Symmetry: D2
Subunit: 234 residues, 4 copies
């Protein structure tokens, strides 16, 4: 089974598996049941921004999700990722839909990891436009790149209609060296902008930024509440 650190933007409360009874941002460490959540007012059809911060000094995994009117939700969990994550990982964006559905449109994704000193090893990438054949992204499941310049993690119909029982992920092509014992500071940040839209009063299931073993793949059956991330809801 893969190892997952994720920040989930969970649009659909699955109260039978420990979701609060509201849409929430969450920090997930090796379980879909978030270690920490914050109530999130998903603004339907608006462009949201998620920013994810971690460094190995503070060891605080933090995420904010904001929309341009100003509504933000933030969540943090102190967690020592040296003890969770393989040294070398892939980083990715994941989304899913189940009985209910939403567009899980990515409009930009940036990522920076650094290992300083003690000098710096670093990876940074930015995608503000996704390309039809995006050679530095590993697309899994239903994830597709436009154009439009967007990354549709899950299936959207010809007529605009998001489809249920969809899951897809984008992972950056290069392995990322997330920690290294000799490093004084290991830090990462990620930001992505997304367009979650539902004509259903029931958007589902959400979007995650995730960190994974290098060979990570969509667990069989991880549509819906499992967010393309987990094989079960344990």
């Amino acid at each position: 089974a893969d190892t997952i650190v994720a920040v989930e933007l969970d649009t659909y409360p699955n109260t039978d598996i420990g979701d609060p009874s509201y849409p929430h941002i969450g920090i997930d460490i090796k379980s879909v049941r978030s270690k920490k959540t914050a109530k999130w007012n998903m603004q339907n059809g608006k462009v949201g921004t998620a920013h994810i911060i971690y460094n190995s000094v503070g060891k605080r995994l933090s995420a904010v999700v904001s929309y341009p009117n100003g509504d933000s939700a933030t969540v943090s969990y102190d967690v020592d990722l040296d003890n969770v994550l393989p040294e070398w990982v892939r980083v990715g964006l994941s989304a899913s839909t189940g009985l209910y559905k939403e567009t899980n449109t990515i409009l930009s994704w940036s990522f920076t990891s650094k290992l300083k000193s003690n000098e710096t090893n670093a990876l940074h990438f930015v995608f503000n436009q996704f390309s039809k054949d995006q050679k530095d992204l590993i697309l899994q499941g239903d994830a597709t790149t436009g154009t439009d310049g967007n990354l549709e993690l899950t299936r959207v119909s010809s007529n605009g209609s998001p489809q249920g029982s969809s899951v897809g992920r984008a992972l950056f092509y290069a392995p990322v060296h997330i920690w290294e014992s000799s490093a004084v500071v290991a830090s990462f940040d990620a930001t992505f902008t997304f367009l979650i839209k539902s004509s259903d009063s029931h958007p589902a299931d959400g979007i995650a930024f995730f960190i994974s073993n290098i060979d990570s793949s969509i667990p069989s059956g991880s549509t819906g509440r499992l967010l393309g991330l987990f094989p079960d809801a344990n």
Copy 2:
């Protein structure tokens, strides 16, 4: 007085004003009496590296100080800097000596400030300090070099530190460190330093700090006050 946030590398235990009883790093929030400290083994005449990190999301200001052998000290403090600093600030390095002394040499210094939101950002790096470093406001006893170095406190051309000394270097531009509509207002800073002393103890330390724009060395803030504070409250 000034509003001060700082990460002190405090080489001299002033246990009478709250220092722990060893060299230490500490996070100073409007007071020289740190909100959190960690024991710090300062390695005499070694080049050390201090990394300071804040994000507005985590609301946690963290510092690590390390030397090449791997030995490191870390302090974090939970704090919302929106509640502490003014929107606009200067960032700087400060050092002092007192009745005891040490070199407070800065070999490099970087800083990055970002405000989203879109994004405003400032980043500078000094790996070399010119004799005329026009983008630094030197205050008190700093000195720009050669040795290519920034000397926060008085040394002799021949390496020897001086007592009762206080010096700061502030970056020339004001920095917009937070802003009420910023969803992320983060910064980090790193400096490398060489603290050397033949004294009976080393004193007093170097701090990275953030102050109001018009911040000057407060009267009599040599020694334990680290060029930062008007008194020890």
Copy 3:
């Protein structure tokens, strides 16, 4: 005199002083009389992007100005800035109007310089505050409250004013070359909105590099772009 290096987006053909007979971009080296120009189709009331890059190794100062439709103008000039600029400088944006006028609105501005053997400076403005403390505003510039930098004088339904000159300089001096720098490079990017209902628009926006103490020269409204004392 000030020493000036600039990339002008010159919206008004001053052919008496060597402008080409069309709006143009140019590379200004110690003179308003461009060392190199390219024809520029300014798109009125559109947002444009200027990208300036100087390659210390390549010894080449290059600019593109584009608009969202893909229309671009490009100019490069081969020049060793070690022999032109003083070592310490301020960088900034300058615009002017004269007898004809345009909005000279800056919506964003970024800048990066690096001196390697590495010192660096980078700043990005995507929004300008009404009190933007890290900008030295000169003349009729003017930031906020709409998040924009208004280099010359607009009233207030956005209607441009004539005889206006305004530049904005980053508050910190920049160490733009050094004798012992193996690489002394910079780029700048600014996005702009030039709008006019005049007969022509005038006069243009420049990115400039100048001495630290550089001020708007007396009578540098108009074709002088707030940059130069005369048109030699």
Copy 4:
């Protein structure tokens, strides 16, 4: 054959294939015969720095090689890489030895690529320390990394002596999007530091930073003067 844009630090003059009669930095466009060279004083056993810059506005491919004493050699060639390179590439470092040899030690490598339009897609990586199992590098031929934190492009013997007839390359794992038609600026730069040490009547053959097709492979027989870059000396 692969398509190759390289900046070569060529230590050994192969005057029978158009090299000048001195060591040199060269710009190579689809030939080992540099389009532009500059005389280079290789400082044997010193750490050199090479910086390579290009953007699609000036279209000038520039390279400098310097040593701490301040000896530098600069080379530039105007060339439109849109017309040379495939849209998507891998970037790498390559070295070779033939009859004569040298260590071709890489101590750091940074690379940044950006595609800007009207305000970006970007890749940036820095290696200041190469690790024993550096998962984001594709190592080809004799190239090895770490524990000493270096990349040895070509064979160095147990006793420190560089071996002849060696070729190795390191390519960054992810494909790079080097040009894109809708971009108003495409730029890249690369920096690497290196330590070429040789013992006799002797240094060969050089180090190149190169840009190639994604599936670029060491051409058979590309030891020696071909720098691990070219199938032949044409």
